[PDB]
């Protein structure tokens, strides 16, 4: 059994294990110093990665759900074009997912400011860098998950509505739950970044 991707996974795992054992045995285990990596690394990489991944993963989830449910509803729409406008609420809730990411990206971009070199790596700047990074990842990944889920559910809703219009209604509740998931992700991202100060 072989695959190139798994071969590289095992190769890099072996290389990292060997490097860690080499550093540890020679008494230089503290050279692998992920904490000092977090301290020395520029806070802006964290902040802008947070924003970029927030909007990017929100858009990935929105688009993924969108083509799932849109392809399903166009296929089901061949016999019943009435399905389009009825089940378009699925596309709508998939798009709202990306709008959440856009809103969070706006909020976090409000935090981006030129910090002084004398104050570059302070407690507040590191805190806000990590906060924006992980809050953007939280919102973006939750939005990706919710967009895929809402797209799957809306595809099922479109197909069921094609089978019978009465089956549509209760699947829209599932779509509502999927949208609430993304809303919760957005509010938790806001709470994570709520007390993060600007770069100063």
């Amino acid at each position: 059994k072989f695959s190139f991707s798994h071969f590289l996974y095992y190769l890099v795992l072996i290389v990292v294990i060997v490097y860690g054992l080499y550093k540890l045995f020679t008494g230089h285990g503290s050279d692998i110093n992920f904490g000092k990596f977090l301290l020395r690394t520029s806070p802006y990489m964290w902040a802008n990665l947070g924003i970029a991944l927030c909007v990017g993963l929100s858009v990935v989830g929105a688009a993924w759900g969108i083509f799932i449910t849109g392809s399903s509803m166009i296929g089901a729409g061949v016999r019943a074009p009435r399905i389009t406008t009825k089940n378009l609420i699925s596309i709508i809730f998939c798009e709202v997912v990306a709008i959440y990411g856009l809103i969070i990206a706006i909020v976090f971009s409000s935090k981006l400011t030129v910090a002084t070199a004398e104050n570059m790596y302070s407690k507040s700047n590191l805190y806000t860098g990590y906060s924006l990074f992980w809050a953007g990842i939280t919102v973006g990944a939750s939005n990706l998950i919710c967009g895929i889920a809402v797209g799957i559910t809306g595809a099922t809703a479109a197909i069921s509505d094609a089978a019978d219009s009465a089956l549509f209604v209760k699947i829209l509740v599932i779509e509502i739950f999927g949208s609430i998931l993304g809303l919760l992700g957005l509010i938790v991202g806001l709470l994570m970044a709520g007390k993060a100060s600007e770069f100063q």
């Binding site: 520029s42 802006y44 990489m45 902040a47 802008n48 990665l49 924003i51 970029a52 991944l53 909007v55 990017g56 993963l57 929100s58 858009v59 990935v60 929105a62 688009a63 993924w64 969108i66 083509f67 849109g70 392809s71 509803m73 166009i74 296929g75 729409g77 061949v78 016999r79 074009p81 389009t84 406008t85 378009l88 596309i91 709508i92 998939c94 798009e95 990306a98 709008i99 990411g101 856009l102 990206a105 706006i106 971009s109 981006l112 030129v114 910090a115 070199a117 570059m120």
Partner: protein
């Protein structure tokens, strides 16, 4: 060099400039290829629908246009002694627009293929096709918006 303006700072700006156009172009290429397969399959029977079915590849193209816009805007913010702040601003703009336009192009390709096929079988599905496809395009549009917001803070 300085602590704020390291020699490696322009790496992020240049790679973001590259990333914008690259990922938006792969998104546009996926959209164009998938929707063009759909168009060519469809219009063997009904070539009269060429200028309807052309919409998804056009939207894929506008995705790459958004990428071009962002890449140009961040490119003219580049400098040898540019700050690390603006370097990561350019990186964030390029990455946001690239990943967003990539996802939007994938969605546009798949939805456009399905839509041209359906709207060739069912003409009333044209408005549905195009209205889903605009909803896929708008995601790359949102990525463009975030890239513009970030780039507005480059210096």
């Amino acid at each position: 060099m300085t602590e704020l303006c390291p020699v490696y700072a322009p790496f992020f700006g240049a790679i973001g400039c590259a990333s914008a156009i690259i990922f938006t172009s792969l998104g546009a290429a996926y959209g164009t290829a998938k929707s063009g397969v759909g168009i060519c399959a469809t219009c063997v029977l009904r070539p009269d629908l060429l200028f309807k079915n052309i919409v998804p590849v056009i939207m894929a193209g506008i995705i790459a246009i958004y990428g071009l816009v962002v890449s140009v805007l961040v490119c003219y913010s580049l400098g040898q002694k540019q700050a690390l702040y603006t370097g990561f601003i350019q990186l964030g703009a390029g990455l946001s627009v690239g990943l967003s336009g990539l996802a939007a192009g994938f969605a546009i390709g798949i939805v456009g293929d399905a839509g041209v096929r359906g709207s060739s079988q069912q003409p009333r599905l044209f408005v549905g096709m195009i209205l889903i496809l605009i909803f896929a395009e708008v995601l790359g549009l949102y990525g463009l918006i975030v890239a513009l917001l970030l780039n507005s803070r480059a210096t």
